[PDB]
Write an enzyme that holds these catalytic residues in place. Structure first.
Site, PDB file in Angstrom:
ATOM      1  N   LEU A  44      34.605 -32.489  31.802  1.00 33.82           N
ATOM      2  CA  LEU A  44      35.046 -31.647  30.685  1.00 33.82           C
ATOM      3  C   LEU A  44      36.532 -31.383  30.702  1.00 33.82           C
ATOM      4  O   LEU A  44      37.149 -31.235  29.652  1.00 33.82           O
ATOM      5  CB  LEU A  44      34.252 -30.312  30.631  1.00 33.82           C
ATOM      6  CG  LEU A  44      32.753 -30.449  30.337  1.00 33.82           C
ATOM      7  CD1 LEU A  44      32.057 -29.100  30.400  1.00 33.82           C
ATOM      8  CD2 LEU A  44      32.496 -31.145  28.974  1.00 33.82           C
ATOM      9  N   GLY A  45      37.104 -31.335  31.886  1.00 37.29           N
ATOM     10  CA  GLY A  45      38.532 -31.087  32.022  1.00 37.29           C
ATOM     11  C   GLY A  45      38.927 -30.767  33.434  1.00 37.29           C
ATOM     12  O   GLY A  45      38.086 -30.731  34.339  1.00 37.29           O
ATOM     13  N   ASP A 152      44.098 -13.218  31.167  1.00 39.47           N
ATOM     14  CA  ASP A 152      44.251 -14.603  30.730  1.00 39.47           C
ATOM     15  C   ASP A 152      43.575 -14.863  29.362  1.00 39.47           C
ATOM     16  O   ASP A 152      43.013 -15.939  29.121  1.00 39.47           O
ATOM     17  CB  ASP A 152      43.762 -15.576  31.832  1.00 39.47           C
ATOM     18  CG  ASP A 152      44.345 -16.987  31.730  1.00 39.47           C
ATOM     19  OD1 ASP A 152      45.410 -17.153  31.082  1.00 39.47           O
ATOM     20  OD2 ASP A 152      43.755 -17.914  32.321  1.00 39.47           O
TER      21      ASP A 152
HETATM   22  C1  LIG Z   1      34.681 -23.254  33.426  1.00 35.73           C
HETATM   23  C2  LIG Z   1      36.103 -22.815  33.209  1.00 35.73           C
HETATM   24  O1  LIG Z   1      36.442 -21.640  33.306  1.00 35.73           O
HETATM   25  N1  LIG Z   1      36.995 -23.823  33.054  1.00 35.73           N
HETATM   26  C3  LIG Z   1      37.208 -24.783  32.037  1.00 35.73           C
HETATM   27  C4  LIG Z   1      36.306 -24.864  30.973  1.00 35.73           C
HETATM   28  C5  LIG Z   1      36.192 -26.044  30.244  1.00 35.73           C
HETATM   29  N2  LIG Z   1      35.201 -26.289  29.269  1.00 35.73           N
HETATM   30  C6  LIG Z   1      33.996 -25.713  28.895  1.00 35.73           C
HETATM   31  C7  LIG Z   1      33.231 -26.257  27.841  1.00 35.73           C
HETATM   32  C8  LIG Z   1      32.066 -25.642  27.439  1.00 35.73           C
HETATM   33  N3  LIG Z   1      31.250 -26.130  26.430  1.00 35.73           N
HETATM   34  C9  LIG Z   1      31.593 -27.350  25.695  1.00 35.73           C
HETATM   35  C10 LIG Z   1      30.492 -28.176  25.146  1.00 35.73           C
HETATM   36  C11 LIG Z   1      31.280 -28.660  26.312  1.00 35.73           C
HETATM   37  N4  LIG Z   1      31.716 -24.491  28.102  1.00 35.73           N
HETATM   38  N5  LIG Z   1      30.612 -23.724  27.858  1.00 35.73           N
HETATM   39  C12 LIG Z   1      30.706 -22.740  28.730  1.00 35.73           C
HETATM   40  C13 LIG Z   1      31.842 -22.841  29.550  1.00 35.73           C
HETATM   41  C14 LIG Z   1      32.236 -21.981  30.623  1.00 35.73           C
HETATM   42  N6  LIG Z   1      32.581 -21.322  31.492  1.00 35.73           N
HETATM   43  C15 LIG Z   1      32.495 -23.990  29.129  1.00 35.73           C
HETATM   44  N7  LIG Z   1      33.632 -24.593  29.545  1.00 35.73           N
HETATM   45  C16 LIG Z   1      37.045 -27.107  30.518  1.00 35.73           C
HETATM   46  C17 LIG Z   1      38.000 -26.993  31.508  1.00 35.73           C
HETATM   47  C18 LIG Z   1      38.100 -25.840  32.285  1.00 35.73           C
HETATM   48  C19 LIG Z   1      39.120 -25.715  33.405  1.00 35.73           C
HETATM   49  C20 LIG Z   1      39.601 -26.869  34.235  1.00 35.73           C
HETATM   50  C21 LIG Z   1      40.527 -26.225  33.254  1.00 35.73           C
HETATM   51  C22 LIG Z   1      41.617 -25.288  33.743  1.00 35.73           C
HETATM   52  N8  LIG Z   1      41.973 -24.351  32.663  1.00 35.73           N
END
Ligand SMILES: CC(=O)Nc1cc(Nc2cc(NC3CC3)n3ncc(C#N)c3n2)ccc1[C@H]1C[C@@H]1CN
Length: 328
Positions: A44-45, A152
């Site tokens: 996801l990232g 944040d």
């Molecule tokens: C989990 C969190 O705090 N980091 C983070 C989150 C996301 N992406 C996503 C994407 C979704 N859903 C979409 C359909 C795919 N969801 N749903 C619930 C959560 C949560 N928690 C969530 N996180 C992507 C990247 C990061 C972090 C590495 C970057 C540094 N800034």
């Protein structure tokens, strides 16, 4: 002499009234689940402190989000876990579902079917901004009442499933417990969402920091200007704020709290008048701008953290009347 001390206007002693285990995260013992329950599906990232994936919980066929941490201070790990566990069940706050050992921990979260940020923000109506702002405020009034500041708040930390009008405030990795008299690290938040207190090195800040961040978000949404305050660095970030809010109120703020300003700042801040919100209004954003939106925006974006609206006061603003009415 030193700077004048400050205390939160609301929820000042909520942590003082709780047993120390609630906020003494350094003494927290992590409860570990089974790593074999989860299988990663796709990436996801990534960031400086983690790598995030979409995963499947194989015991119940549930879709989850797995945050694998990079080397981070054990107490900072314990801090994020503890805040998440204390906020569990809170309105519009992401659920921490599990914690497994990958070497490093991996926090397992509830999955939100997130609408593509850029696809979403260019389709949002006036009502949607008001609706989603109201939902962020439920999450902020909740974490503040539980003695926690997010630190944040920005669009990328807000998951929206637009189809289901579901909002979740995510990434509690920078969140802290508020304690009256505590001096906190000012090297927090993303440049464009940094409060003037961080930029002038005023350490005795509180929940009102999240309200400045929220004001930044609201400004970028109603004016379709992302980011709203576009600094080239932390010093220039303050110059960009002063070019809108004016230098007069800035120096009154510095004076009120006896803040020693960095010698660098002296020459770059100059002298600026306080601008009217109407200069950011054009034919492409006018449908999102109303006298109510501007009045609410002015009350969030103040240099003086004690004079910004609390999340509860923000919820009672005329900008939210139709949203409040429709929810009943
Ligand atoms: C989990 C969190 O705090 N980091 C983070 C989150 C996301 N992406 C996503 C994407 C979704 N859903 C979409 C359909 C795919 N969801 N749903 C619930 C959560 C949560 N928690 C969530 N996180 C992507 C990247 C990061 C972090 C590495 C970057 C540094 N800034």
């Amino acid at each position: 002499s030193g700077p004048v001390p400050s205390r939160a206007r609301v929820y000042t002693d909520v942590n003082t009234h709780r047993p120390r285990e609630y906020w003494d995260y350094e003494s927290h013992v992590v409860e570990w689940g089974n790593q074999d329950d989860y299988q990663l599906v796709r990436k996801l990232g990534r960031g400086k402190y983690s790598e995030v994936f979409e995963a499947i919980n194989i015991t119940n066929n549930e879709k989850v989000v797995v945050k694998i941490l990079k080397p981070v201070k054990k107490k900072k790990i314990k801090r994020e876990i503890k805040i998440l566990e204390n906020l569990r069940g809170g309105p519009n706050i992401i659920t921490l579902a599990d914690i497994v050992k990958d070497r490093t921990p991996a926090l397992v979260f509830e999955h939100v079917n997130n609408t593509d940020f850029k696809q979403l923000y260019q389709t949002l109506t006036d009502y949607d901004i008001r609706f989603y702002m109201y939902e962020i405020l439920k999450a902020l009034d909740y974490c503040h009442s539980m003695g926690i500041m997010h630190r944040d708040v920005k669009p990328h930390n807000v998951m929206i499933d637009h189809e289901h009008r579901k909002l979740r405030l995510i990434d509690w990795g920078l969140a802290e417990f508020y304690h009256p008299g505590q001096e906190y690290n000012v090297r927090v938040a993303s440049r464009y969402f940094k409060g003037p207190e961080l930029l002038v090195d005023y350490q005795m800040y509180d929940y009102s920091l999240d309200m400045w961040s929220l004001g930044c978000m609201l400004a970028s949404m109603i004016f379709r200007k992302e980011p709203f305050f576009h600094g080239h660095d932390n010093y220039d970030q303050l110059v960009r704020i002063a070019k809108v809010l004016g230098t007069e109120d800035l120096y009154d703020y510095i004076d009120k709290y006896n803040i020693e300003l960095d010698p660098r700042f002296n020459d770059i801040l100059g002298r600026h008048s306080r601008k009217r919100w109407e200069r950011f209004v054009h034919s492409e954003n006018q449908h999102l701008v109303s006298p109510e939106a501007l009045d609410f925006l002015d009350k969030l974006l103040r240099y003086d953290h004690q004079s910004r609206l609390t999340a509860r006061e923000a919820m009672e603003h005329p900008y939210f009347y139709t949203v409040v009415k429709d929810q009943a």
